[PDB]
Subunit: 223 residues, 3 copies
């Protein structure tokens, strides 16, 4: 069932990428870079999850299963998602690449701390986990602080769309560290099968879902 | 023989980099970035192949030359960049198209490394994904990228078409040799595959850049 | 002792990053990118050295201890330091990104050759070491050649500050390959404890120290 679920995930990611390619042919005032980003995220995630379906993207550490392919996925896909968010706030204005790369730096560190925490035992696990959570808090502060102020400077309609997308992303992202802690990698209150379902359903909304809401909103500012 | 051949490869790469450095001192209207790219490719490839000569860049009932993938994951995207920048010579840069090719290429090389580590059907799933990546790269090369070259004048477009065919012809050889050799069906011997992955890169790296840079320098007059 | 020293290092790095964040609030004509770079260097280095303190960032190769976390540190931190140096030479003028990325390329190769040399035995070790030294020589030629000429073109006061920071960095950087050769990774004339102290004290002056001298000099040009 675990294998079948991952095949299904990869196929949905493929259909996501195809949809975003079609949208790109009729760009409606949205730069090609934002369509490229929306295509790479699902394609990369699909390939990583395919490696799990084929039983290559995991190994047995001590007496627990590490799905390391998830981290290979997230270390590319999550920074690209934060880029898409930042570029949404900056739509019709000057780009602030310093703020954008600050988010990329924080995000990559967040994902690495998660991978190391999964490979750690005892107290050490929760030291790394904690550093990742602090990284996520700072990303949220930027998202609702300076980045939201840039969105406001680009007009009411854009700011309203940015706020909607920011809440959508924020809501989904806080679920990842929560699920991680409750599942086998953490306290082990939740079963493997449960965690797998969560890390199949969340990414679908986090990747393909986010980009639909994000791109449709921007295309609507053109009509 | 395998070790000696790899030393010889690294030495030729060094001579290539030195030649491109000399050319850069008299740039003839070609941006410094295109000279830098032409220098990095051979130097990085030389270092990787050196690791094979010293017997570090491989591990073993089949021998995997993993240093090749470390080479290609840096050198091949840089080659596609040089190609893209050739199409865009004198006109506006389209970085979205350029980075699309870098994305496709890096994926192609990773699928190859995973296929080499895979057994049975799984090997050919990964191999297939890499081939599809190469097909799309070729479609971009002869489609949108060629249309940009045409928009920059007949002289530039003619040079671009020549370099595009040159690269395309050499690149299709890599997946073909991979499939026929030990990593695939095993119809060809290890020694044969080694010779191929010595001779092809010399024409793919040092050779491509000579044809590419000389053509662009000629457009100065 | 070795563990405690690494904890102390990480804490000092944290304080360095916090100081540079405060400075950034009153930027005094220094671009935000240069403040971000000064913050990332210590934060990344601190995290890497923390992995050593927890005894994760090292392993036993035959009869020697390899501190591989150092290389994970340097492969990110050293290119960013050369960027800060290059951006100093270019302060008030056009950026030359080709020259900047040439330095990044050389530096990354330098650090990789070092990691491979540490994993090598006999003559092979010193082949890789040699390639890294030649990389460092070319970096020094660029620093005091074309990069210094760019600094001159941006006025006497800037050029004087650049020359001071360039010498400071150059003096500290030549110490790394020297210590490497004399310590366990090389001829083994120096003991592990000695090498550890060197690779605690040097980075503090190389990272937090360099950025203080660099940023204070540039802030002074505002007045
Ligand atoms: C943890 C890994 C960190 C790796 C990422 C390194 C990030 C540091 C780089 C900063 C580049 C700054 C962006 C250039 C500024 C352009 C001007 C602007 O702000 O718009
Ligand atoms: C698949 C492995 C990893 C690949 C990641 C590559 C990153 C893809 C995104 C790049 C963004 C491109 C930015 C282009 C900016 C200029 C846009 C233009 O004017 O055309
Ligand atoms: C050893 C691994 C090396 C990996 C990095 C290689 C980098 C090569 C690419 C260089 C890009 C040059 C950027 C050109 C910008 C033109 C504008 C300017 O020069 O100011
Ligand atoms: C994105 C694409 C890369 C996905 C990464 C997965 C790594 C797969 C490597 C597995 C090797 C085979 C392991 C085994 O058979 O035990
Ligand atoms: C280690 C892995 C790191 C992966 C990082 C992926 C790259 C991240 C961000 C690049 C996106 C920059 C987009 C700039 C577009 C400029 C524009 O269109 O105005
Ligand atoms: C979740 C926390 C978000 C807090 C937002 C802070 C906005 C003001 C600011 O610090 O710029
Ligand atoms: C919405 C809440 C979903 C989580 C509840 C189910 C937990 C099952 C488990 O712990 O194995
Ligand atoms: C390994 C990568 C090494 C490549 C660095 C080459 C140095 C070239 C110096 C001149 C730079 C320029 O083109 O202005
Ligand atoms: C620089 C180019 C990249 C070279 C990297 C590959 C070689 C590194 C592996 C060294 C291991 C030596 C020990 C052994 O395997 O016998
Ligand atoms: C086998 C090689 C396959 C591909 C050849 C190139 C495909 C056709 C070129 C692109 C056509 C176009 O978009 O105008
Ligand atoms: C040019 C074509 C090269 C043909 C070489 C085939 C012989 C190799 C082999 O089967 O071992
Ligand atoms: C972010 C910091 C980057 C450096 C981190 C490296 C730590 C690697 C952890 C490897 C697992 C250690 C196994 C063990 O606990 O014995
Ligand atoms: C060019 C600069 C090269 C500098 C390198 C010098 C190291 C040479 C090897 C040192 C002696 C090795 C003795 C031994 O292996 O026992
Ligand atoms: C690894 C993921 C790579 C996906 C790249 C998708 C390429 C899309 C085509 C580029 C746009 C062409 C414009 C005409
Ligand atoms: C025993 C398990 C304890 C879990 C600790 C998790 C703490 C939450 C993240 C750190 C937040 C720092 C403020
Ligand atoms: C107006 C200032 C910003 C307020 C931010 C509110 C906090 C958002 C948290 C959402 C996460 C779920
Ligand atoms: C011993 C119990 C530890 C307390 C756990 C606190 C509740 C979960 C903390 C993690 C939530 C992640 C989101 C942070 C923003
Ligand atoms: C005969 C051996 C030549 C070695 C040259 C150095 C390696 C290539 C560049 C790195
Ligand atoms: C297994 C050791 C390999 C060290 C070289 C790493 C180079 C990776 C570049 C991508
Ligand atoms: C592992 C991935 C490494 C990718 C190599 C980086 C290639 C990017 C070169 C782009 C150059 C663009 C020049 C614009 C002028
Ligand atoms: C056992 C032999 C399997 C051969 C696989 C060949 C794959 C070719 C992919 C072509 C895709 C278009
Ligand atoms: C995956 C989506 C397919 C991308 C194909 C792009 C080919 C370029 C078309 C140019 C006309
Ligand atoms: C590796 C850790 C990276 C640290 C980046 C720090 C980000 C802070 C950005 C400050 C906000 C600027 C306004
Ligand atoms: C494989 C590891 C590669 C690490 C590369 C680290 C990034 C260094 C380059 C960033 C500096 C660019 C600053 C540009 C300033 C423009 C204003
Ligand atoms: C091994 C890495 C070094 C190889 C260098 C090849 C020759 C290039 C010389 C560049 C000198 C620049 C001076 C301005
Ligand atoms: C045993 C380790 C030796 C490392 C020595 C590093 C190089 C020392 C400095 C020599 C090169 C200076 C170049 C200045 C060029 C000015 C123009
Ligand atoms: C015990 C011997 C310790 C040697 C310390 C050398 C460090 C040099 C730092 C210079 C500033």
């Amino acid at each position: 069932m675990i294998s079948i679920l991952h095949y299904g995930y990869s196929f949905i990611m493929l259909l996501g990428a195809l949809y975003f390619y079609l949208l790109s042919k009729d760009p409606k005032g949205v730069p090609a870079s934002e369509y490229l980003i929306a295509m790479v995220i699902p394609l990369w995630s699909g390939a990583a999850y395919l490696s799990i379906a084929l039983g290559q993207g995991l190994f047995q550490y001590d007496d627990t299963t590490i799905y390391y392919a998830r981290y290979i996925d997230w270390v590319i896909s999550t920074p690209l998602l934060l880029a898409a968010l930042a570029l949404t706030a900056m739509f019709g204005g000057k780009k602030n690449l310093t703020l954008l790369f600050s988010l990329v730096a924080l995000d990559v560190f967040m994902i690495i701390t998660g991978f190391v925490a999964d490979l750690s035992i005892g107290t050490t696990k929760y030291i790394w986990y904690s550093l990742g959570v602090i990284a996520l808090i700072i990303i949220l502060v930027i998202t609702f602080g300076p980045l939201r102020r840039i969105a406001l400077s680009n007009g009411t309609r854009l700011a309203r769309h940015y706020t909607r997308v920011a809440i959508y992303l924020s809501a989904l992202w806080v679920c990842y560290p929560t699920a991680w802690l409750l599942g086998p990698s953490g306290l082990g209150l939740a079963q493997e099968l449960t965690e797998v379902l969560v890390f199949i359903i969340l990414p679908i909304f986090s990747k393909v879902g986010f980009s639909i809401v994000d791109l449709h909103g921007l295309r609507k500012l053109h009509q």
